[PDB]
XYZ file of C-alpha atoms in Angstrom:
578
model
C 26.114 -20.619 6.834
C 28.358 -21.261 3.831
C 25.434 -22.511 1.711
C 24.594 -20.119 -1.113
C 21.136 -21.556 -1.914
C 19.065 -22.279 1.194
C 15.561 -22.993 -0.073
C 14.928 -25.123 3.034
C 13.999 -21.948 4.913
C 11.366 -21.355 2.207
C 10.310 -24.967 1.681
C 10.066 -27.178 -1.384
C 6.476 -26.225 -2.261
C 7.188 -22.486 -2.139
C 10.380 -22.888 -4.180
C 8.620 -24.150 -7.314
C 6.182 -21.234 -7.372
C 8.856 -18.537 -7.115
C 10.936 -19.823 -10.036
C 8.056 -20.019 -12.537
C 7.151 -16.364 -11.994
C 10.852 -15.483 -12.409
C 10.939 -17.397 -15.697
C 7.791 -15.573 -16.802
C 9.455 -12.340 -15.659
C 12.612 -13.037 -17.686
C 11.047 -14.203 -20.963
C 7.575 -14.445 -22.469
C 7.735 -17.716 -24.403
C 4.146 -18.816 -25.077
C 4.789 -22.598 -24.797
C 5.119 -23.454 -21.125
C 5.383 -27.257 -20.980
C 9.171 -26.764 -20.962
C 8.754 -24.462 -17.955
C 7.534 -27.424 -15.877
C 10.596 -29.510 -16.731
C 12.703 -26.378 -16.119
C 11.231 -26.242 -12.596
C 11.883 -29.999 -12.299
C 15.529 -29.748 -13.386
C 16.261 -26.829 -11.059
C 14.573 -28.601 -8.140
C 16.614 -31.758 -8.713
C 19.595 -29.391 -8.915
C 18.461 -28.051 -5.526
C 18.018 -31.607 -4.212
C 21.589 -32.389 -5.245
C 22.601 -29.182 -3.451
C 20.790 -30.518 -0.350
C 23.133 -32.046 2.295
C 26.370 -32.132 0.271
C 28.276 -29.059 -0.882
C 31.904 -29.852 -1.765
C 30.960 -32.463 -4.382
C 28.940 -29.903 -6.388
C 29.096 -26.265 -7.511
C 26.359 -24.898 -5.242
C 28.655 -22.217 -3.753
C 28.008 -19.761 -6.580
C 25.914 -16.626 -6.894
C 22.254 -17.241 -7.699
C 22.098 -14.315 -10.137
C 24.994 -15.940 -12.009
C 22.969 -19.177 -12.074
C 20.010 -17.254 -13.532
C 22.535 -15.959 -16.058
C 23.927 -19.327 -17.119
C 20.861 -21.606 -16.908
C 18.786 -19.262 -19.088
C 21.281 -19.654 -21.975
C 20.325 -23.327 -22.363
C 16.699 -22.231 -22.738
C 17.481 -19.379 -25.146
C 18.802 -21.424 -28.055
C 16.351 -20.130 -30.684
C 17.570 -16.687 -31.734
C 14.490 -15.738 -33.776
C 12.222 -16.228 -30.734
C 14.654 -15.452 -27.890
C 16.663 -12.357 -28.805
C 18.077 -12.056 -25.269
C 21.373 -13.674 -26.343
C 22.050 -10.948 -28.925
C 24.241 -8.711 -26.756
C 26.305 -11.208 -24.731
C 26.107 -14.523 -22.884
C 25.167 -12.617 -19.648
C 27.897 -13.629 -17.208
C 28.475 -12.172 -13.742
C 30.700 -9.163 -14.427
C 29.535 -8.401 -18.050
C 25.916 -8.647 -16.949
C 22.955 -7.332 -18.928
C 20.249 -7.433 -16.268
C 20.046 -3.630 -16.650
C 18.612 -4.181 -20.144
C 16.790 -7.388 -19.173
C 14.615 -5.283 -16.830
C 13.115 -3.198 -19.667
C 13.820 -5.601 -22.556
C 10.178 -6.748 -22.455
C 8.577 -4.352 -19.942
C 5.167 -2.734 -20.681
C 4.484 -5.196 -23.516
C 0.830 -6.371 -23.556
C 1.524 -9.042 -26.166
C -1.426 -11.217 -25.146
C -4.811 -9.834 -26.317
C -7.233 -10.842 -23.547
C -8.112 -13.617 -21.097
C -11.432 -15.382 -21.671
C -13.780 -16.834 -19.047
C -15.833 -19.899 -20.078
C -18.648 -21.599 -18.142
C -18.170 -23.012 -14.651
C -18.156 -26.740 -15.529
C -14.907 -26.943 -17.526
C -12.598 -25.472 -14.886
C -14.726 -27.088 -12.179
C -13.707 -30.424 -13.723
C -10.158 -29.110 -14.272
C -10.099 -28.204 -10.580
C -11.442 -31.696 -9.872
C -8.592 -33.536 -11.625
C -5.691 -31.174 -12.474
C -5.825 -28.653 -9.625
C -2.088 -27.949 -9.291
C -1.808 -27.745 -13.092
C -4.705 -25.270 -13.014
C -2.872 -23.227 -10.355
C 0.319 -23.260 -12.450
C -1.783 -22.188 -15.445
C -3.242 -19.343 -13.375
C 0.217 -18.174 -12.233
C 1.508 -18.373 -15.809
C -1.582 -16.480 -16.997
C -1.334 -13.665 -14.437
C 2.467 -13.453 -14.596
C 2.500 -12.313 -18.243
C 0.316 -9.192 -18.026
C 2.090 -7.097 -15.389
C 5.803 -8.014 -15.176
C 6.549 -5.568 -12.324
C 4.068 -7.016 -9.846
C 5.004 -7.662 -6.220
C 6.331 -11.201 -5.911
C 5.309 -12.026 -2.280
C 1.740 -10.954 -3.154
C 1.163 -13.698 -5.731
C 1.163 -16.456 -3.125
C -1.525 -14.503 -1.245
C -3.645 -14.262 -4.402
C -3.059 -17.957 -5.142
C -4.107 -18.896 -1.592
C -7.214 -16.688 -1.864
C -7.925 -18.215 -5.296
C -7.672 -21.756 -3.883
C -9.802 -20.867 -0.833
C -12.465 -19.125 -2.940
C -12.388 -21.906 -5.526
C -12.491 -24.967 -3.256
C -16.101 -24.335 -2.159
C -17.967 -23.082 -5.247
C -18.066 -26.503 -6.927
C -19.293 -28.152 -3.715
C -22.015 -25.581 -3.041
C -25.075 -25.010 -5.213
C -23.977 -21.478 -6.158
C -21.832 -21.547 -9.297
C -21.750 -18.168 -11.059
C -22.453 -15.836 -8.125
C -20.164 -17.831 -5.807
C -17.033 -16.882 -7.741
C -17.733 -14.099 -10.280
C -17.627 -11.038 -7.897
C -14.587 -12.672 -6.251
C -12.892 -12.814 -9.673
C -13.925 -9.198 -10.350
C -12.587 -7.929 -7.009
C -9.404 -9.993 -7.455
C -8.853 -8.415 -10.884
C -9.516 -4.928 -9.455
C -7.203 -5.497 -6.466
C -4.528 -6.875 -8.798
C -4.823 -3.816 -11.065
C -4.605 -1.420 -8.086
C -1.642 -3.228 -6.497
C 0.112 -3.435 -9.884
C -0.333 0.330 -10.324
C 1.009 0.979 -6.797
C 4.040 -1.302 -7.288
C 4.651 0.253 -10.732
C 4.619 3.748 -9.178
C 6.946 2.776 -6.300
C 9.520 0.865 -8.377
C 9.353 3.569 -11.081
C 10.064 6.287 -8.500
C 12.955 4.202 -7.135
C 14.346 3.738 -10.657
C 13.979 7.417 -11.569
C 14.531 9.625 -8.512
C 17.479 7.901 -6.834
C 17.375 6.602 -3.268
C 17.392 9.682 -0.980
C 13.876 10.674 -2.078
C 12.682 7.109 -1.405
C 14.290 7.165 2.051
C 12.722 10.554 2.875
C 9.296 9.382 1.636
C 9.472 6.197 3.689
C 10.641 7.949 6.868
C 7.706 10.386 6.459
C 5.245 7.493 6.060
C 6.719 5.544 8.993
C 6.617 8.694 11.115
C 2.938 9.098 10.264
C 1.968 5.469 10.886
C 3.869 4.662 14.103
C 4.136 7.735 16.363
C 5.019 6.016 19.648
C 8.536 4.958 18.598
C 11.880 6.720 18.838
C 14.312 7.403 16.000
C 16.492 4.263 16.139
C 13.754 1.700 15.409
C 12.482 3.952 12.603
C 16.023 4.145 11.153
C 16.507 0.350 11.296
C 13.053 -0.234 9.766
C 13.604 2.265 6.954
C 17.044 0.755 6.184
C 15.639 -2.772 5.925
C 12.588 -1.625 3.905
C 14.887 0.306 1.546
C 16.982 -2.881 1.165
C 13.878 -5.006 0.379
C 12.527 -2.578 -2.215
C 15.910 -2.018 -3.869
C 16.431 -5.779 -4.199
C 12.926 -6.827 -5.222
C 12.209 -4.359 -8.079
C 15.432 -5.612 -9.711
C 15.362 -9.409 -9.529
C 16.635 -11.964 -6.981
C 13.166 -12.945 -5.809
C 14.269 -15.591 -3.280
C 16.145 -12.949 -1.278
C 13.051 -10.697 -1.565
C 10.737 -13.317 -0.033
C 13.248 -14.312 2.674
C 13.990 -10.681 3.615
C 10.257 -9.917 3.820
C 9.925 -13.020 6.046
C 12.601 -11.899 8.519
C 11.189 -8.345 8.511
C 7.819 -9.869 9.466
C 9.591 -11.873 12.197
C 11.295 -8.730 13.547
C 8.109 -6.655 13.442
C 6.155 -9.414 15.218
C 8.873 -9.981 17.831
C 9.472 -6.344 18.859
C 5.887 -5.097 18.837
C 5.864 -3.600 22.347
C 8.020 -0.518 21.710
C 6.665 0.287 18.227
C 2.873 0.113 18.048
C -0.206 -0.780 20.076
C -2.608 -1.984 17.360
C -0.752 -4.772 15.515
C -0.735 -7.157 18.496
C -3.879 -8.782 17.100
C -2.408 -8.588 13.585
C 0.660 -10.656 14.524
C -1.570 -13.576 15.628
C -1.844 -14.841 12.066
C -0.245 -17.204 9.567
C 2.958 -16.064 7.899
C 1.513 -14.835 4.590
C -1.268 -13.125 6.549
C 1.425 -11.593 8.768
C 3.211 -10.309 5.665
C 0.039 -8.789 4.199
C -1.610 -7.520 7.410
C 1.228 -5.173 8.446
C 1.148 -3.180 5.177
C -2.484 -2.080 5.781
C -2.895 -1.184 9.457
C -4.502 1.724 11.291
C -2.198 4.449 12.529
C -1.970 4.836 16.287
C -2.980 7.634 18.625
C -0.985 10.771 19.349
C 1.223 11.099 22.445
C -0.389 12.981 25.309
C 2.331 15.564 26.050
C 4.403 17.073 23.242
C 6.203 20.443 23.279
C 6.368 22.733 20.285
C 9.322 22.309 17.937
C 9.683 26.081 17.528
C 11.713 26.100 20.757
C 14.268 23.666 19.308
C 15.123 25.278 15.956
C 14.634 29.045 16.369
C 16.148 30.346 19.604
C 18.761 27.576 19.785
C 21.758 29.419 18.350
C 24.008 26.351 17.937
C 21.941 24.566 15.280
C 24.144 25.136 12.209
C 26.985 23.310 13.961
C 24.671 20.308 14.222
C 23.810 20.777 10.540
C 27.501 20.958 9.620
C 28.172 17.843 11.707
C 25.412 15.871 9.976
C 23.076 16.969 7.191
C 20.701 14.103 6.379
C 20.511 12.918 10.005
C 19.489 16.443 11.064
C 16.864 16.620 8.306
C 15.693 13.166 9.419
C 15.266 14.500 12.975
C 13.308 17.506 11.660
C 11.098 15.435 9.336
C 10.382 12.844 12.050
C 9.519 15.495 14.639
C 7.295 17.360 12.188
C 5.515 14.305 10.783
C 4.854 12.695 14.155
C 2.467 15.473 15.173
C 0.234 15.990 12.114
C -1.702 12.892 10.990
C -3.911 14.689 8.453
C -1.020 16.112 6.428
C 0.002 14.422 3.195
C 3.488 13.033 2.651
C 3.997 15.202 -0.459
C 3.231 18.382 1.515
C 5.617 17.256 4.280
C 8.377 16.695 1.711
C 7.687 20.194 0.307
C 8.002 21.686 3.804
C 11.248 19.809 4.518
C 12.699 20.915 1.162
C 11.704 24.545 1.871
C 13.272 24.260 5.345
C 16.593 22.958 4.021
C 16.833 25.502 1.195
C 16.165 28.250 3.730
C 18.699 26.907 6.228
C 21.495 26.370 3.696
C 21.088 30.014 2.676
C 20.920 31.208 6.288
C 24.215 29.536 7.231
C 25.793 31.203 4.193
C 25.172 34.590 5.842
C 27.433 36.107 8.485
C 24.668 36.428 11.100
C 22.534 33.258 10.932
C 20.322 33.814 13.993
C 18.668 36.834 12.400
C 18.248 34.869 9.162
C 15.958 32.181 10.619
C 14.009 34.540 12.886
C 10.915 34.229 10.653
C 10.689 30.826 8.980
C 7.317 29.644 10.306
C 5.466 32.392 8.440
C 6.539 30.780 5.156
C 4.745 27.516 5.958
C 1.388 29.339 6.073
C 0.963 29.902 2.269
C 2.285 26.387 1.590
C -0.604 24.937 3.626
C -3.226 27.623 2.881
C -3.561 26.583 -0.776
C -4.417 22.819 -1.001
C -6.896 22.667 1.905
C -8.903 25.456 0.242
C -8.587 23.745 -3.160
C -9.806 20.363 -1.850
C -12.608 22.088 0.132
C -13.786 24.048 -2.940
C -13.786 21.024 -5.258
C -15.454 18.840 -2.598
C -18.264 21.359 -2.097
C -18.634 21.620 -5.892
C -19.105 17.831 -5.965
C -21.572 18.090 -3.067
C -23.512 20.773 -4.945
C -23.697 19.569 -8.531
C -23.660 15.768 -8.312
C -21.240 13.306 -9.851
C -22.105 13.471 -13.569
C -22.118 17.273 -13.497
C -18.818 17.154 -11.587
C -17.292 15.036 -14.372
C -18.827 17.469 -16.876
C -17.273 20.440 -15.056
C -13.842 18.802 -14.840
C -13.945 17.988 -18.543
C -15.021 21.504 -19.540
C -12.372 23.045 -17.273
C -9.230 21.205 -18.414
C -10.024 21.356 -22.125
C -8.947 25.006 -22.377
C -5.639 24.427 -20.598
C -4.087 21.853 -22.967
C -6.262 21.905 -26.124
C -3.900 19.861 -28.330
C -4.179 16.523 -26.517
C -6.497 13.891 -28.019
C -10.080 12.946 -27.176
C -10.025 9.601 -25.220
C -7.036 10.567 -23.053
C -9.042 13.625 -21.924
C -12.171 11.512 -21.375
C -10.299 8.894 -19.297
C -8.471 11.512 -17.178
C -11.701 13.458 -16.517
C -13.602 10.295 -15.562
C -10.802 9.171 -13.229
C -10.724 12.577 -11.492
C -14.513 12.321 -11.192
C -14.032 8.965 -9.460
C -11.399 10.506 -7.139
C -13.772 13.379 -6.321
C -16.563 10.909 -5.595
C -14.286 8.642 -3.547
C -13.487 10.722 -0.434
C -16.077 13.399 0.046
C -18.023 10.873 2.139
C -15.260 11.100 4.794
C -14.707 13.738 7.518
C -12.279 16.628 7.079
C -9.300 14.908 8.748
C -9.428 11.884 6.420
C -9.651 13.802 3.144
C -6.087 14.893 2.383
C -4.494 11.363 2.072
C -7.386 10.410 -0.231
C -6.736 13.576 -2.220
C -2.981 12.964 -2.465
C -3.089 9.154 -2.755
C -5.718 8.339 -5.393
C -4.832 11.377 -7.493
C -1.123 10.541 -7.794
C -1.901 7.347 -9.735
C -3.868 9.297 -12.355
C -1.146 11.917 -12.935
C 1.715 9.491 -13.537
C -0.683 7.333 -15.579
C -1.309 10.421 -17.745
C 2.444 11.124 -17.755
C 3.311 7.656 -19.064
C 0.456 7.887 -21.572
C 1.812 11.187 -22.898
C 5.395 9.891 -22.697
C 4.694 7.340 -25.443
C 3.234 9.955 -27.817
C 4.557 13.446 -26.981
C 2.323 16.140 -28.492
C 2.314 19.046 -26.030
C 5.369 20.616 -24.390
C 4.218 22.077 -21.062
C 2.771 18.712 -20.020
C 6.164 17.052 -20.550
C 7.916 19.985 -18.860
C 5.935 19.270 -15.690
C 6.800 15.569 -15.927
C 10.550 16.288 -15.949
C 10.506 17.969 -12.522
C 10.549 16.316 -9.108
C 7.593 14.362 -7.735
C 7.020 16.877 -4.921
C 6.136 19.688 -7.346
C 4.331 17.775 -10.120
C 0.835 18.634 -8.836
C 1.491 22.440 -8.517
C 3.037 22.315 -11.994
C -0.261 20.965 -13.313
C -2.535 23.102 -11.152
C -0.894 26.464 -11.945
C -1.613 26.281 -15.677
C -3.514 29.072 -17.403
C -5.284 29.352 -20.751
C -3.402 29.642 -24.041
C -3.993 32.120 -26.856
C -1.902 30.208 -29.416
C -4.591 27.625 -30.224
C -6.214 27.943 -33.651
C -10.035 27.570 -33.686
C -10.991 24.228 -35.203
C -13.026 24.154 -38.413
C -16.664 23.087 -38.352
C -17.253 19.384 -38.858
C -20.708 18.586 -40.197
C -20.886 14.789 -39.847
C -19.875 14.108 -36.227
C -22.469 16.358 -34.573
C -25.308 14.316 -36.053
C -26.132 10.929 -34.569
C -28.026 7.709 -35.232
C -31.296 6.677 -33.605
C -29.942 3.499 -31.939
C -28.237 5.631 -29.259
C -31.121 4.830 -26.879
C -30.368 1.130 -27.444
C -26.835 1.615 -26.079
C -25.943 1.127 -22.443
C -25.747 4.193 -20.195
C -21.931 4.173 -19.908
C -21.651 4.091 -23.720
C -24.179 6.946 -23.955
C -22.003 8.883 -21.500
C -18.833 8.177 -23.548
C -20.670 9.460 -26.646
C -21.905 12.479 -24.632
C -18.513 13.694 -23.413
C -16.994 12.788 -26.813
C -19.442 15.129 -28.563
C -19.002 17.617 -25.698
C -15.214 17.748 -25.997
C -15.496 18.095 -29.795
C -18.053 20.887 -29.254
C -15.831 22.815 -26.854
C -12.692 22.352 -28.982
C -14.694 23.784 -31.880
C -15.354 26.984 -29.898
C -12.349 28.049 -27.777
C -14.005 31.253 -26.526
C -15.096 31.553 -22.895
C -18.856 31.538 -23.449
C -19.823 29.035 -20.752
C -22.799 31.115 -19.576
C -24.593 30.146 -22.792
C -23.157 26.615 -22.833
C -25.210 25.451 -19.840
C -28.539 26.336 -21.476
C -27.295 24.853 -24.779
C -26.418 21.642 -22.884
C -29.879 21.649 -21.236
C -31.867 22.059 -24.465
C -29.516 19.599 -26.205
C -30.256 16.998 -23.509
C -34.004 17.739 -23.658
C -33.928 17.634 -27.456
C -32.116 14.292 -27.565
C -34.570 12.773 -25.097
C -37.385 14.185 -27.253
C -36.243 11.952 -30.128
C -36.047 8.974 -27.753
C -39.828 9.242 -27.443
C -40.002 9.682 -31.220
C -40.016 6.550 -33.377
C -39.420 7.968 -36.838
C -36.413 5.619 -37.458
C -33.688 8.250 -38.127
C -36.168 10.613 -39.862
C -36.500 12.606 -36.632
C -32.707 12.426 -36.295
C -32.421 14.198 -39.657
C -34.481 17.045 -38.188
C -32.603 16.783 -34.876
C -29.093 17.660 -36.066
C -30.476 20.210 -38.542
C -31.996 22.236 -35.700
C -28.855 21.729 -33.590
C -26.639 23.185 -36.319
C -29.280 25.874 -36.835
C -28.929 26.725 -33.137
C -25.132 26.344 -33.288
C -24.450 29.786 -34.778
C -26.432 31.544 -32.018
C -23.412 32.304 -29.849
């Protein structure tokens, strides 16, 4: 096992795909015919490394080889500025600036989709060149996308594209497949961006606590040792795949799939059918599985940590192992609880217990600790129940209207389309999981909503305008949502002056599509409510009703903007009646 580059475990066909995405992930050079001969020269380098070792220099580090072989590519300084700092050797490495040297750069405008015949013929003659073109096309938009998932999308692309040219269906055979592949790629790119961003920001202990809470919730039938080995190997895979070294990432995911499909008896009872799959299907199928059933007999954990007097000696012997025992025993029993709430309860437990061992008499200090968990769980169930019944009462468009009229008085200095996009995404989250029962509502409420808040945080991080929004972003991830939800109104906002030309419209608004009419409607609504900062919402509902009736009155009218001159005149005549 002295070989430093064993691609024979991966195979020759899989080796060429994983180096092209790494070259797209290291630089964004728009010619790519040199990328094919780059793949060819590194695979003949690999074929010379096959079966003889002492005659060559194949006993080197692969990250050093990514350092040195990229210098021969980067010879043009005005197009490749990655040689500006150093030559990127092993010990003076600059991978820590190569990670964000081109990250979040949408340099390409858009991808076009022509008619079915041209790439049907390109699939008919140049199919592997079309697949390389698709990997080069999708590898330039999101650079922090999960590298064992691209082979799954390429296999699904080949399987969904090998039958549409043969069958009579051409547009409808592939177009919703392309739409759902783009939507699944956007969702998985957002999830991988959130996970690698949390690993880059909040250390490693928070990632280990989050993953032991999730693995305690998913697999309840296992003991602590298999959970500890699984969380150590998953922490290793995610700390060495959001960084580079993609070959080790794919091989480590492969042996984790081998270990989880070879020791399935003591861990779970539902993935026995899931392990009867191909290898890429085995890698994808494990990450979305149903959680198992509860154990039949389980005692209360109040008997283990209250009347047991000798618990601080176990805490002084081991801290994080003892908190791992407490978090595993608390998250095995409650499947409806969110992971963020469980991390809040574990943090409250450790900051109570490190104060209670500071006292002289610790057994009277932790006599009442389970009363403090009642207001930490009494709030968000009532909040989710109240907003879910508001969605069940008013309907979805009025729910989006209510969430846009509610948050506009909290932070009234943020711009228009950021507010419109955040209110429409929270309307989608509120319409997503009120069709579920009460047990399956909290992970919807703390899973879909966490993408929208850090999306808003990285949108406000580029252009900082407010201060209390950025103050909530600088805290920990376990208290970001109560930092946002405990905001009140501000009295420091100046009332905006009266515009006269944006309240009026044009008579082709009925010719627009309904989504564009809605974007115009909440645009004029958010300008209308930022004109009047006073809490006069009891008149605003009737004003909204006669405004909607009086804009559909002019839809029946055909005066060709003459009725629209009398429309906005009566609206600004009725504007002062407040």
